[PDB]
């Protein structure tokens, strides 16, 4: 109601000729009275007779050039009597009732269009009732003003998306009501389309090129997130709009996958022409997920159900990759809540950035393939009767999950703990392993470390006996060789 | 001693209020031309609402010497300078009405009267007075609205406020010197 | 039926042939203004009244003046008429004289101004209460302050209310 009363108090109008002619009316009709008040300033020169009279007189530039003190009077106090006593004067007092009557007629007319003007404002009373209904409790009461000016102009209120932690650019929400009793969702860009216009979900897609190593034939399979193509978000229903707001949250989430795109740019795995980036990794040549440096997931396709083993795995990717940047969205807020400056400006060294989509690629590919290859090299030590085992032991030694210890604070401790158990996933370097012998007893051991998908294998070995002898060394070519040297210094 | 002290007793008083309604109109006239932007709907009502008030004081200032001035009725005789360029004198000394007088007729004719004389006219006066007396009835109804009220200091403070746990300044004084906070 | 009321035009060219050059000017004004009602003309007619010979019988050392007359000071035949006018209209007190309905003038070069008045006298003051009329090129002006104000004043306001009516903008 207040906003709408303020709108009527903003002079505002978009009229061509209509708006134009009216303001010209003001100019001339106001100017008239301005100019006639200047005859009033001419009566001022009419005084003359005094110096303060001259002051008043200079009122006309023509008085500046018409020197005279000019005028003189006599007495008709009798004529004052005639003005007052005349039958004409009695009658003229009737011109007082007459003009005053027509003024009262005007008054009545103005007054009535006023209650009908309050009736267009009841459209708004209803809109506020509509807003009272629907989206409520926890939710944005963002109050905004646009169309510039800074005062008056256009002003209203609503919620938006990013909040705690900072993606950074073009992130928010803005909401208004149509005459169909439905709410239209503005975004301050992401340009309106009641509960959106066009929506892009993040999407995913994983290909494998095998052919049993036959013709370089690659197929994909994609974990699909489609609630439906049919849209409801009913008019007059903010509850359905709350659902549309949840859709809006998902759209804001895709913006996060844009940061992951950029975080790819720090790696050697596909980004082609600077116009499209493709996620892909060497082994069995396979590909996992995508979204063009142009965008992510934009909706228009045929709809059939068939699945595929690639497809099942692919849904696992999206949730991880998605999840992984909630982590980022979390360790950002750790710093913010925790220390003064704030976190702003996001992932220097692409250390913070890299986590998203960088550690997943690493994880899958590196530790795993390299461990497999280490195992073949450990088959070069496959020769002795022997034995040799792997643990989470390196993993156990650092980066504990859900520990009671906490940090500085009770409030701080909780969030730190939340980070930790999810932190396993983000930390995913290879654990490492060992092998041993007894009978006057010897012992050796190796650790696989991924540092950014590059693989180090650092080993150890001690032969425990009456007098102690030992060596430790920290590349895969040398590892093969070290194993050959170990055979000689072992039993054989 | 040669020529005369003619008139203009409250003339200065008219001039002052003549000017203020000129001054407030003139300024609105200057802005009225920058139709590029209107001054803020508050601003124009501040200037055009005290600019209308200016003409109330200028309206009344006319009646207050109103017996005196119609009686004075000065028409000019002057320097011959006034005679050359002529009109300025016809213009500057002329009272009439504009196209204005006409909606004055529209209004006069809008009333229920015109040529029916004195006895019937005196009666209409008593009748309009009766309308004003039926307007007093507004006084009676205003009593019903019955709305007039007010917004011992100590009596009211107990209800209202107990605010302050201590002296801010003294607290600090202590932290810095070990001077200890005394009763405030 | 319409009135020219609060002074209007002249009577022009009609005693421009009879010729206006002061003194005669006053009489020309009389016809023109349609405003000589009693005394000045009455003085004119009584002398003008004799029309050769029917029967019409009824009774009917220099420098001294009025204060305004002393300020004015009259030059030529109109000065002689002035004596006649005093004679026509003079209520008499000890050191004083008052007039009824005389019409008279004050002038310069191309134009003048004239009043029709009543004088009240005394040793140290004397005032004439009258009507005043200015007279340039066959036109007469008779005007009133307070009436003068109501003029472009009501005009200012009706035009301000046109302005206020125009504030019918959003």
């Amino acid at each position: 109601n207040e906003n709408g009363e303020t709108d009527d108090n903003i002079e505002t109008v978009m009229t061509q000729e209509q708006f134009v002619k009216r303001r010209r009316d003001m100019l001339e009709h106001i100017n008239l009275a301005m100019n006639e008040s200047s005859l009033a300033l001419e009566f001022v020169s009419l005084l003359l007779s005094s110096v303060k009279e001259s002051t008043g007189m200079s009122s006309m530039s023509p008085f500046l050039r018409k020197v005279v003190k000019p005028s003189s009077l006599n007495s008709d106090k009798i004529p004052y009597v005639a003005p007052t006593k005349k039958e004409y004067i009695e009658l003229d007092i009737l011109n007082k009732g007459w003009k005053l009557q027509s003024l009262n007629e005007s008054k009545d007319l103005l007054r009535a269009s006023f209650n009908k003007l309050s009736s267009i404002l009841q459209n708004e009373h209803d809109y506020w009732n509509k807003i009272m209904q629907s989206i409520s409790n926890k939710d944005v009461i963002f109050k905004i003003r646009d169309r510039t000016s800074g005062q008056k102009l256009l002003a209203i209120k609503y919620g938006y998306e990013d909040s705690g932690s900072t993606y950074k650019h073009d992130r928010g929400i803005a909401n208004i009501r149509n005459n169909i009793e439905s709410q239209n969702l503005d975004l301050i860009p992401h340009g309106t389309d009641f509960v959106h216009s066009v929506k892009k979900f993040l999407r995913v897609r994983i290909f494998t090129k095998i052919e049993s190593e036959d013709d370089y034939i690659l197929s994909g399979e994609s974990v699909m997130d489609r609630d439906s193509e049919s849209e409801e978000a009913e008019t007059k229903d903010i509850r359905k709009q709350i659902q549309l707001l949840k859709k809006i949250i998902f759209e804001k989430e895709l913006m996060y996958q844009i940061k992951k795109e950029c975080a790819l740019l720090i790696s050697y795995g596909v980004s082609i022409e600077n116009e499209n980036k493709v996620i892909i990794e060497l082994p069995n040549e396979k590909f996992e997920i995508e979204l063009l440096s142009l965008d992510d997931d934009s909706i228009v396709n045929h709809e059939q159900d068939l699945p595929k083993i690639n497809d099942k795995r692919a849904n696992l990717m999206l949730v991880m990759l998605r999840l992984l940047l909630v982590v980022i969205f979390k360790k950002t807020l750790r710093s913010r809540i925790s220390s003064p400056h704030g976190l702003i400006n996001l992932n220097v060294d692409d250390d913070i950035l890299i986590i998203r989509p960088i550690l997943g690629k690493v994880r899958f590919a590196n530790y795993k393939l390299l461990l497999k290859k280490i195992i073949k090299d450990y088959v070069l030590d496959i020769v002795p009767g022997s034995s040799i085992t792997e643990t989470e032991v390196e993993r156990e030694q650092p980066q504990e999950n859900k520990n009671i210890d906490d940090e500085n604070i009770t409030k701080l401790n909780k969030e730190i703990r939340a980070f930790d158990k999810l932190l396993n996933i983000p930390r995913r370097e290879l654990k490492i392993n060992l092998p041993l012998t007894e009978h006057k007893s010897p012992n050796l051991s190796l650790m696989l470390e991924s540092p950014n998908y590059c693989n180090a294998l650092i080993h150890i070995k001690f032969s425990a006996g009456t007098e102690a002898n030992a060596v430790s060394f920290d590349v895969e070519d040398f590892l093969h060789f070290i194993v050959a040297e170990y055979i000689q210094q072992k039993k054989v | 001693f040669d020529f005369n002290g003619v008139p203009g007793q409250a003339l200065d008083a008219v001039r002052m209020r003549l000017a203020q309604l000129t001054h407030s109109l003139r300024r609105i006239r200057d802005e009225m031309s920058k139709a590029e932007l209107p001054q803020w709907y508050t601003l124009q009502s501040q200037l055009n609402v005290t600019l209308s008030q200016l003409v109330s004081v200028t309206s009344t200032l006319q009646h207050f010497q109103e017996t005196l001035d119609s009686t004075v009725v000065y028409p000019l005789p002057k320097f011959p300078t006034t005679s050359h360029e002529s009109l300025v004198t016809t213009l500057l000394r002329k009272k009439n009405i504009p196209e204005v007088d006409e909606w004055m007729k529209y209004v006069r004719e809008t009333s229920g009267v015109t040529t029916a004389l004195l006895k019937d006219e005196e009666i209409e006066k008593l009748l309009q007075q009766d309308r004003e007396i039926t307007n007093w009835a507004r006084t009676t109804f205003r009593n019903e609205y019955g709305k007039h009220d007010f917004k011992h200091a100590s009596l009211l403070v107990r209800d209202s406020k107990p605010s302050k746990p201590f002296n801010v300044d003294d607290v600090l004084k202590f932290t810095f010197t070990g001077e200890k906070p005394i009763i405030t | 039926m319409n009135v020219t009321p609060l002074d209007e035009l002249q009577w022009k060219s009609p005693e421009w042939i009879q010729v206006f050059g002061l003194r005669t000017e006053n009489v020309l004004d009389y016809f023109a203004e349609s405003p000589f009602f009693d005394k000045t003309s009455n003085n004119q007619v009584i002398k003008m009244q004799r029309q050769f010979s029917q029967l019409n019988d009824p009774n009917a050392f220099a420098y001294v003046d009025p204060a305004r007359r002393q300020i004015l000071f009259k030059y030529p035949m109109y000065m002689q008429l002035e004596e006649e006018l005093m004679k026509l209209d003079g209520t008499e007190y000890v050191l004083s004289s008052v007039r009824e309905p005389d019409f008279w003038v004050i002038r310069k070069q191309r134009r003048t101004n004239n009043s029709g008045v009543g004088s009240a006298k005394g040793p140290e003051i004397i005032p004439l209460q009258d009507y005043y009329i200015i007279g340039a090129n066959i036109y007469q002006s008779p005007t009133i302050f307070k009436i003068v104000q109501s003029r472009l004043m009501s005009t200012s306001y009706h035009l301000n209310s046109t302005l206020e009516s125009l504030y019918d903008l959003i």
């Binding site: 009122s59 | 000017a19 016809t90 | 035009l9």
Partner: peptide, 25 residues
């Protein structure tokens, strides 16, 4: 004190204040 200088506008081209009737003989 009041403003500063006094706002000219002087005008003989306005609507009109004089009528006209006392000619014909």
């Amino acid at each position: 004190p009041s403003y500063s200088p006094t706002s000219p506008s002087y005008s003989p081209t306005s609507p009109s204040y004089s009528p006209t009737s006392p000619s014909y003989s």
